[PDB]
Design a protein around this motif. Structure first.
Motif, PDB file in Angstrom:
ATOM      1  N   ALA A   1       9.881  35.262  37.265  1.00  0.00           N
ATOM      2  CA  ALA A   1       8.788  35.107  36.311  1.00  0.00           C
ATOM      3  C   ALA A   1       7.907  33.932  36.715  1.00  0.00           C
ATOM      4  O   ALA A   1       8.390  32.805  36.858  1.00  0.00           O
ATOM      5  N   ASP A   2       6.619  34.196  36.892  1.00  0.00           N
ATOM      6  CA  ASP A   2       5.602  33.165  37.001  1.00  0.00           C
ATOM      7  C   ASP A   2       4.759  33.159  35.733  1.00  0.00           C
ATOM      8  O   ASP A   2       4.733  34.130  34.978  1.00  0.00           O
ATOM      9  N   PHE A   3       4.071  32.047  35.497  1.00  0.00           N
ATOM     10  CA  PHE A   3       3.361  31.853  34.235  1.00  0.00           C
ATOM     11  C   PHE A   3       1.875  32.188  34.368  1.00  0.00           C
ATOM     12  O   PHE A   3       1.002  31.365  34.109  1.00  0.00           O
ATOM     13  N   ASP A   4       1.586  33.434  34.757  1.00  0.00           N
ATOM     14  CA  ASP A   4       0.212  33.943  34.778  1.00  0.00           C
ATOM     15  C   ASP A   4       0.154  35.221  33.938  1.00  0.00           C
ATOM     16  O   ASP A   4       0.176  36.337  34.456  1.00  0.00           O
ATOM     17  N   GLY A   5       0.037  35.047  32.625  1.00  0.00           N
ATOM     18  CA  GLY A   5      -0.078  36.179  31.730  1.00  0.00           C
ATOM     19  C   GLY A   5       1.187  36.978  31.522  1.00  0.00           C
ATOM     20  O   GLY A   5       1.116  38.095  31.006  1.00  0.00           O
ATOM     21  N   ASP A   6       2.345  36.442  31.899  1.00  0.00           N
ATOM     22  CA  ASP A   6       3.593  37.174  31.758  1.00  0.00           C
ATOM     23  C   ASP A   6       4.093  37.133  30.319  1.00  0.00           C
ATOM     24  O   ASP A   6       3.683  36.296  29.515  1.00  0.00           O
ATOM     25  N   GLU A   7       4.987  38.067  29.999  1.00  0.00           N
ATOM     26  CA  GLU A   7       5.610  38.142  28.687  1.00  0.00           C
ATOM     27  C   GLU A   7       7.093  38.441  28.854  1.00  0.00           C
ATOM     28  O   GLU A   7       7.512  39.017  29.859  1.00  0.00           O
TER      29      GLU A   7
HETATM   30 MG   LIG Z   1       3.138  37.114  37.368  1.00  0.00          MG
END
Ligand SMILES: [Mg+2]
Ligand SMILES: [Zn+2]
Ligand SMILES: [Zn+2]
Ligand SMILES: [Zn+2]
Lengths: 521, 34, 66, 44, 95, 528, 95, 255, 115
Positions: F157-163
């Motif tokens: 998980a990266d923090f670019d629009g993830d849920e």
């Molecule tokens: Mg991502």
RNA sequence: GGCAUAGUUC
DNA sequence: CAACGGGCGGAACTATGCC
């Protein structure tokens, strides 16, 4: 070819191909062929001359235009399968000239090689310093940025609309944006971006935003939503009464006027009644429309009219200002997307010698693996342009714009040539040992916010056929617990948790069964 | 009468004239008119 | 839309300089010289005037509802 | 109830159960008039 | 009704036979940004349903189709956009 | 038909029995938070006030539960329902009568979720069991799911629009199950490859190398701060290494306090040469490689991805195997906090000054490129004069293409080596590559020297037009430029043909990414 | 009268064809609006260009494991009159 | 174990700028004063807007947000006022707020500029700084109208950035890098600071191992609300009251 | 939606105490001070002043979370001296320095204008 | 209320 | 050897037309 160039008998649209080896001539007058204009090179010199250039640059009050250029036999339309019998030159004054002979029989020439890019990819500055997936990602994300989308948005009742407060045209712009009108209806703001690792809240593609800048209107926008309702028994727009109508809810009807419509300027919180409509049950049934939960907007405009048939028609618009929170999504023009991580006030952000705190801090780890050097070059060119007073030119293939020339130009304004600047720590006041790379980059606020994505459920509404929870955030539905998730729980071994998720948390039920025949009794 | 090393403005004058004459959605309009 | 009252980065008031800036440009000034004359010293303030696009002029074309 | 016409900008009284027509201009789009209720905005 | 229905739904054909009718024509115009509007108005489509061949960037798309602008996902390389100076012929008769 | 009802996905069996929508679930955006523990998750106050947990009334908690009921559904630390012994429900969302608020043991109160609650956190798709782990709830102001950064690797998980999804177990039995089985610290070492599944990620990792260099001497006040951020600290400040003429500590002297227990380990830095282990100075290591940890003290060496990373036998793996999850959790948290608050002093960046080379290096790169192009021209001349002899097992085209590709690969690699060896000791690309944070020497080579050859389907760029790649080349041109060898670096920019060829090259990567996913998912489902 | 035909915006048969920016502003239409879309039941529809194989040309391909070695098809149409296509194949059996 | 003995020198003093040098002070104290300049200096600004009529082309929240950022001269009455949360009145009284009124209509064929010149206050000492050009609020067509009532509370920059009394606070110590607090990979590319005391050939001062940061250089530029000397004095008094209240609470807790 | 109001960063609510004193049991003569609704603006001055004292062996501060407003200060002093006395002396010395600084700045203003 | 289609995020 | 039938990723979010 002479007849097509004179535009006498054969229209400029027709293509002619000669297959020299196979001895065939093919002429197409068909519709649907795709073609682009090219300059004509006769011997080794362009047929385009300084007289043509002057007559074009006096285009006003002279009725000399592109059609008069085409009619002179200077340019030509070449479709795809006529391009297979042509010799092209990318640049006139570079490829027509005497060299070590590669080709001396050029038949055409390119107007400008940067006209191979589409509408959305003509806004990327320095796309030739980027990586192709990054250019593709920016082409995708250019259709989601929020700016003024049309000048007459005040008379449009569009289901969803998003307009930015203070859009700015880029300080580093491509030459081919004047035709896309990005100067007149832009979408983004020039922000002072510092590439540093400050407090760990920008790790893994996150963004630290200045809260004092946000308090001054930075990246603020509006959100417009429209509702419609017509009175198609007898549906009537009217204000319902609690002790006379069959259907009813726990909402407030005191906002409505006599005819059942909210007047503009009335603040409506979530789960209120906008339009009150009632069905005469054969004694009245309520079919009022309710705000989508948790909007907290102000009624902006109400329009009353007649539909095609003749029933009364109504569209109501609600606005809500969106201040950038710590979940909103931002992106530059180089495929670098990220969400706000945390917001610091001006006193906490690191500052230069001159009290210039960055608006945005992005992590330095985003660069080495993505290879978006157009980002750094745009930052440097913007730092030069904001001081010089001009607007930088970042058209793709130039040969007259180098990093060395930009750095030399920047060194003449008192800054470090390569863009770095000594910053001080915000909390402690001490100099940071490593100098930080800071400059004005053009950022975009994407459509994806967090107030439109947060969702939770605990024993809400339930489907009819399966008696399982509904589907959809708008319907207060649950989250699917799929087969991959149940396989993961099997691997864990949490048998009781798995049984709870698949039976008790979802639909529980009881039946009776006969001990002789296994049939429900 | 050649245009040497003054080309970086001549080409963009030509392109500006093109987009003043035609526009960006000329295909849809021309197809429907025909 | 309309020029912001404050500079986002530092807070210097730039909301009273758009008319003067346009007048200086109309009086045959370069953008750098106009920004120098108006007192905009640092590039954070300069970009507020350089990059501004004034759409309220276009919005004033359409007639009001009443 | 007063609705403002969208073409001649003239307000005219229209009650319930009434075709939405505008006198003296013959238009068919009417806009509700701004409320007299007062709403408070912080200046943030 | 025929013209109105075919333009409204996108199923290019008669209503009774909307099974083999090719859906995906006549989309609803994007209005999020001016660039979105323009890139929607200048858009192509390949009716192919997973093969890489129709999804790759052929050499003949130079100056006719944008090399970068494409969607990502189930339609990568099957939805494309015109280049800036590209034109599409309108048709005549070869008399 | 009924067979259609039962047939496939969205069909009864496989869409409502093997997987179905559940209650007590939430989904919102995730953002970083380095101030949380490994097994903690930040939850907005809205979601917590919306989700409830049923607590049984006993004499140990009847007063507290009664106060929660008094607070009611409005105030966040409240409750929503009261469940009688008979099972009949009592509402608390509206104003109730004072009689129903009476509580007796055996009742159930459905209070709002509070701090310390245990939840299961998931990111779809769920590939391995480290994608559904148990976390401890902490309530934070704004409205995203804050989670730590070392837990990024298990979830991918990266923090670019993830849920990500939240599931709240509703019984003491299942809560104890999740607490004893699926908590995050208990899943540090995976059984798939017996390696630690989570490690330091790229920002504490780009900074622990700089911290653990020899030069780092720390002042008294800086030591005070860093010790103030240590949670497993005894309370005694160690004697400084440099005692005169001014007391100075060292980065290793504080990472020794971070390292737990008595851990013995020997690793090797990523720039350790092949002569130190053989010749003299085996145990002296002039460049400060050869990490040695004796008795829980960092005696020597520089820490990088190969020591704190997710590889077998690393320092974190030894810490787990020796001390347990409860101490490895503190290990992770302390490393992150101490290194971040020190990084607030040193700082980090990346810029054009870090992506620009020297004039001598530019001359070397251009010379190498010209020699390679000349050699390709010579090979083409020999092939045209028919003097090229085929290699056994290969066709004439195959051997010509092999020779050309080999020459071009040698050129690209030589220019890359020159660009690498011409770097500096302050270069930030080198900082992020040596420490193993993010990037690679090939990326540095493409930025500085040469982007390299573009290939389509494993072969050079094909002849799309009639016997030529583009309308700008003559027919039958097999030079390096004709078939797509980009001589320029990303800093210098690409000429239009190289731009188009690079786009053609990147399209293949996008296609493979969009294609492999469904087949991989189907294979995993069949195996399961 | 045989029916009503939808009109594309800004086209030769629209009410906004040839008007100046001041008239466009008077009609509450944006002078920057590009046009080229239909208005069907209020919503705005955009037709998407659909790719198809060129007609009236002989193409010779080959199939992987079919009966024939080489095939050749000529998708034939008559000046957009009727009978949309009729793909005649002239194959050649394998060895 | 005692306090320092700081000294000051004012290099330049104008109507919008103060440059001074603090000496014999700790870096923590200097930076705390620097932070207090920005955040905790009370200022009067508009914080309550009620729009009677807005037929303009900007929505009500847009206009209110623009109104909030117009600075009001609070030179002398910012000390007299009370916080609205700290006052005995019901909502607003003259002892804790200043009331403004705007009422503009356009009846001409020329676009009218509604500026801060049109804001009218009851108290003659709290007026926009462009009332002894003008801060533009909105532009009006013919027939468009604006009318509202606004209240100006008291607050400081920690709450909102409209109460921030400064424009840019330049803070700098050790202009020549004698303490090596920042390390230059190449010292000769870096421009010399304004206060550098070096020749044209030497780039960095020689290392001074036994030195600590002293002689901080300031430059406080005012946004027009307060005058740039009262910004500094209110910061020294404002920080001093924070420490005093901490000492009072500690004394209660110990006993 | 979940946005805390801006005034919560400096206003003590009903029940909250400004400063609470706790002892540290790991090391003798150590004490921890927890201050609510404060930040680096006070933490840094108090720490740097405590370090000047020759009878203070440890002196630090930290903000446990940037979204929650609270300051923790830890000070350990030599025997025959208590951390509470060290803290109070530090605050008194800071106040004296600030008062002297204000006096000198006022006289410098007076010298600069009309002088 | 449900069916279908389109677009978008990961 | 030929013909027939079943099989083909995981989540999530908007919108619009029609019964
Ligand atoms: Mg991502
Ligand atoms: Zn500024
Ligand atoms: Zn009318
Ligand atoms: Zn009062």
């Amino acid at each position: 070819r002479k007849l097509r160039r004179q535009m006498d008998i054969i229209v400029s649209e027709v293509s002619m191909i000669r297959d020299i080896r196979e001895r065939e001539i093919r002429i197409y007058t068909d519709a649907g062929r795709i073609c682009r204009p090219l300059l004509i090179v006769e011997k080794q010199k362009l047929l385009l001359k300084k007289r043509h250039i002057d007559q074009l640059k006096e285009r006003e009050y002279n009725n000399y235009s592109w059609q008069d250029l085409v009619a002179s036999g200077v340019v030509e339309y070449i479709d795809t399968l006529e391009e297979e019998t042509v010799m092209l030159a990318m640049t006139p004054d570079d490829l027509q000239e005497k060299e070590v002979a590669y080709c001396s029989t050029y038949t055409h020439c390119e107007i400008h090689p940067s006209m191979i890019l589409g509408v959305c990819a003509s806004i990327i500055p320095f796309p030739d310093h980027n990586q192709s997936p990054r250019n593709t990602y920016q082409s995708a994300m250019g259709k989601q940025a929020m700016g003024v989308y049309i000048t007459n948005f005040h008379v449009r009742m569009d289901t969803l609309a998003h307009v930015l407060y203070y859009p700015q045209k880029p300080l580093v712009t491509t030459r081919s944006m004047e035709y896309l009108r990005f100067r007149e209806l832009p979408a983004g703001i020039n922000s002072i971006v510092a590439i540093a690792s400050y407090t760990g809240y920008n790790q893994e593609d996150s963004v630290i935003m200045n809260r004092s800048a946000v308090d001054r209107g930075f990246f603020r926008s509006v959100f417009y939503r429209s509702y419609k309702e017509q009175e198609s028994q007898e549906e009537v727009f009217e204000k319902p009464t609690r002790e006379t109508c069959q259907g009813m809810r726990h909402a407030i009807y005191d906002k409505l006027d006599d005819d059942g419509l909210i007047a503009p300027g009335v603040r409506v919180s979530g789960d209120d009644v906008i339009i009150g409509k009632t069905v005469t049950l054969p004694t009245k049934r309520d079919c009022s429309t309710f705000l989508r939960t948790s909007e907290t907007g102000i009624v902006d405009q109400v329009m009353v009219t007649l539909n095609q048939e003749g029933y009364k028609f109504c569209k109501i618009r609600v606005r809500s200002v969106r201040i950038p929170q710590i979940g909103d999504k931002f992106a530059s023009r180089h495929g670098q997307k990220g969400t706000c991580g945390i917001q610091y006030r001006q006193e906490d952000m690191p500052f230069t010698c001159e009290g210039i705190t960055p608006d945005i801090i992005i992590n330095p780890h985003a660069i080495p693996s993505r290879m978006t050097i157009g980002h750094l070059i745009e930052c440097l060119q913007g730092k030069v342009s904001a001081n010089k007073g001009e607007i930088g030119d970042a058209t793709p293939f130039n040969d007259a714009v180098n990093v060395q020339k930009i750095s030399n130009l920047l060194s003449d304004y008192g800054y470090h040539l390569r863009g770095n600047e000594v910053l001080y720590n915000g909390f402690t006041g001490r100099k940071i040992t490593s100098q930080i790379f800071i400059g004005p980059t053009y950022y975009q606020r994407l459509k994806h916010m967090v107030d439109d994505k947060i969702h939770s459920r605990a024993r809400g509404p339930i489907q009819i056929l399966n008696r399982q929870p509904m589907e959809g955030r708008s319907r207060d539905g649950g989250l699917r617990f799929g087969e991959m998730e149940r396989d993961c729980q099997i691997a864990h071994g949490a048998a009781q948790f798995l049984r709870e998720r698949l039976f008790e948390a979802s639909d529980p039920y009881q039946v009776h069964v006969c001990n002789l025949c296994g049939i429900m009794a | 009468e050649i245009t040497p090393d003054l080309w970086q403005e001549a080409c963009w004058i030509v392109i500006s004239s093109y987009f003043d004459e035609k526009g960006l959605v000329r295909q849809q309009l021309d197809s429907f008119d025909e | 839309m309309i020029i912001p009252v404050r500079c986002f980065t530092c807070g210097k008031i730039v909301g009273n300089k758009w008319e003067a800036y346009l007048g200086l440009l109309q009086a045959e000034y370069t953008e750098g010289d106009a920004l120098d004359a108006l007192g905009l010293k640092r590039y954070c303030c300069r970009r507020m005037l350089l990059a501004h696009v004034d759409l309220i002029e276009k919005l004033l074309n359409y007639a009001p509802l009443e | 109830m007063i609705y403002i016409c969208g073409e001649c900008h003239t307000e005219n009284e229209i009650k319930s159960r009434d075709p939405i027509r505008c006198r003296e201009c013959g238009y068919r789009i009417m806009y509700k008039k701004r409320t007299k209720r007062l709403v408070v905005f912080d200046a943030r | 009704d025929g013209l109105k229905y075919s333009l409204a739904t996108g199923n290019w054909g008669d209503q009774k036979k909307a099974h083999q009718a090719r859906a995906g024509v006549s989309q609803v115009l994007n209005r999020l940004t001016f660039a979105s509007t323009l890139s929607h108005l200048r858009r192509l489509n390949s009716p192919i349903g997973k093969l890489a061949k129709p999804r790759q960037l052929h050499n003949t798309l130079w100056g006719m189709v944008c090399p970068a602008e494409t969607p990502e996902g189930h339609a990568v390389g099957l939805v494309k956009n015109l280049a800036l100076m590209a034109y599409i012929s309108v048709g005549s008769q070869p008399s | 038909s009924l067979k259609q009802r039962l047939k496939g996905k969205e069909g009864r069996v496989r869409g409502n029995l093997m997987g179905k929508r559940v209650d007590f679930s939430a989904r919102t955006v995730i953002t970083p938070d380095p101030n949380l523990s490994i097994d903690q998750v930040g939850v907005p106050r809205s979601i917590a006030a919306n989700m409830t947990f049923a607590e049984i009334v006993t004499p140990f908690n009847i007063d507290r539960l009664q106060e929660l009921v008094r607070r009611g559904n409005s105030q966040y630390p409240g409750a929503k329902y009261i469940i009688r012994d008979n099972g009949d429900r009592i509402d608390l969302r509206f104003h109730p009568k004072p009689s129903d608020l009476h509580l007796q043991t055996g009742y159930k109160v459905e209070r709002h979720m509070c701090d310390g609650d245990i939840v299961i956190f998931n990111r779809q798709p769920t590939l391995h069991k480290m994608s559904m782990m148990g976390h401890r709830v902490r309530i934070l102001p704004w409205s995203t799911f804050r989670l730590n950064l070392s837990v990024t690797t298990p979830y991918n998980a990266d923090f670019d629009g993830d849920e990500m999804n939240l599931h709240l177990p509703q019984s003491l039995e299942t809560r104890a199950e999740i607490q004893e089985l699926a908590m995050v610290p208990r899943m540090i070492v995976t059984p798939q490859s017996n390696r630690p599944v989570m490690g330091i990620v790229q920002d504490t990792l780009t900074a622990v190398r700089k911290f653990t260099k020899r030069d780092v001497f720390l002042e008294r006040g800086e030591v005070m701060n860093l010790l103030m951020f240590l949670s497993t600290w005894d309370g005694k400040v160690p004697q400084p290494a440099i005692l005169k003429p001014r007391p100075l500590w060292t980065g290793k002297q504080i990472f020794s306090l971070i390292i737990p227990g008595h851990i013995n380990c020997i690793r090797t830095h990523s720039t350790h040469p092949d002569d130190e282990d053989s010749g003299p100075y085996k145990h002296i290591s002039p460049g400060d490689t050869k990490v040695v940890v004796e008795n829980g003290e960092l005696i020597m060496g520089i820490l990088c991805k190969k020591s704190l990373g997710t590889s077998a036998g690393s320092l974190v793996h030894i810490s787990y195997l020796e001390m347990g999850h409860d101490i490895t959790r503190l290990f992770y948290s302390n490393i992150q906090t101490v290194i971040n608050n020190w990084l607030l002093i040193e700082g980090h960046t990346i810029g054009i000054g870090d992506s620009i080379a020297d004039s001598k290096t530019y001359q070397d790169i251009q010379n190498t490129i010209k020699k390679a192009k000349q050699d390709v021209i010579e090979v083409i001349e020999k092939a045209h004069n028919n003097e090229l002899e085929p290699t056994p097992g290969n066709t004439l085209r195959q051997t010509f293409e092999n020779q050309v590709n080999r020459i071009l690969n040698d050129a690209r690699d030589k220019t890359g080596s020159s660009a690498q060896k011409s770097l500096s000791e302050y270069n930030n690309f080198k900082s992020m590559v040596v420490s193993g944070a993010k990037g690679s020497k090939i990326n540095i080579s493409q930025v500085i020297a040469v982007v390299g050859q573009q290939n389509v389907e494993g072969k050079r760029i094909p002849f799309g037009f009639k016997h030529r790649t583009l309308p700008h080349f003559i027919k039958d041109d097999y030079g390096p430029e004709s078939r797509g060898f980009v001589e320029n670096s990303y800093l210098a920019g690409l000429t239009p043909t190289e731009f188009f060829f690079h786009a053609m090259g990147g399209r293949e990567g996008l296609i493979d990414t969009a294609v492999k996913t469904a087949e991989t998912g189907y294979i995993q489902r069949r195996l399961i | 009268f045989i029916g009503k035909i939808p009109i594309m915006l800004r086209s030769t048969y629209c009410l906004l064809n040839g008007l100046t920016d001041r008239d466009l502003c008077e009609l509450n239409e944006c002078p920057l609006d590009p046009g080229g879309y239909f208005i069907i039941n209020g919503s705005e529809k955009v037709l998407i260009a659909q790719e198809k194989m060129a007609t009236n040309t002989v193409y010779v391909f080959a199939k992987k494991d079919s009966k024939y070695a080489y095939t050749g098809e000529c998708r034939s149409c008559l000046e957009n009159s009727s009978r949309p296509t009729s793909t005649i194949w002239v194959s050649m059996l394998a060895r | 174990p005692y306090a320092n003995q700081p000294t000051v020198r004012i290099t330049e003093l104008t109507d919008e700028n103060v440059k001074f040098i603090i000496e014999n002070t700790d870096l923590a104290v200097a930076n705390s004063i620097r932070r207090v300049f920005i955040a905790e200096v009370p200022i009067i600004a508009i914080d309550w807007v009620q729009i009677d009529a807005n037929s303009s082309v900007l929505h009500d929240e847009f206009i209110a947000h623009r109104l909030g950022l117009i600075p009001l001269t609070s030179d002398d009455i910012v000390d007299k006022l009370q916080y609205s949360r700290d006052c005995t009145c019901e909502e607003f009284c003259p002892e804790c707020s200043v009331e403004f009124t705007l009422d503009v209509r356009c009846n001409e064929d020329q676009t009218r500029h509604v500026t801060s010149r049109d804001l009218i206050s009851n108290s003659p000492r709290v007026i926009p700084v462009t009332s002894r050009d003008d801060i533009l609020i909105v532009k009006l067509r013919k027939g468009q109208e604006l009318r509202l009532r606004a209240y100006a509370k008291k607050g400081f920059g920690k709450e909102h950035a409209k109460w921030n009394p400064t424009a840019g606070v330049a803070f700098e110590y050790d202009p020549d890098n004698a303490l090596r607090h920042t390390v230059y990979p190449k010292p000769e590319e870096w421009p010399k600071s304004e206060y550098s005391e070096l020749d044209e050939d030497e780039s960095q001062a020689p290392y001074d191992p036994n030195g600590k940061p002293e002689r901080f250089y300031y430059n406080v530029e005012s946004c027009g609300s307060l005058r740039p000397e009262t910004i500094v004095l209110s910061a020294l008094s404002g920080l001093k009251k924070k420490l005093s209240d901490l000492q009072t609470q500690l004394s209660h807790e110990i006993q | 939606m979940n946005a805390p109001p801006a005034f919560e960063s400096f206003l003590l609510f009903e029940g909250e105490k400004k400063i609470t004193i706790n002892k540290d049991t790991k090391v003798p003569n150590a004490c921890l001070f927890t201050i609510n609704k404060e930040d680096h603006t006070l933490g840094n001055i108090i720490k740097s002043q405590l370090l000047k004292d020759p009878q203070v062996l440890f002196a630090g501060y930290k903000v446990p979370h940037p979204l929650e407003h609270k300051i923790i200060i830890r000070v350990q002093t030599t025997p025959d001296y208590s951390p509470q006395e060290a803290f109070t002396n530090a605050i008194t010395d800071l106040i004296s320095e600030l008062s002297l600084l204000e006096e000198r700045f006022r006289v410098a203003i007076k010298d600069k204008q009309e002088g």
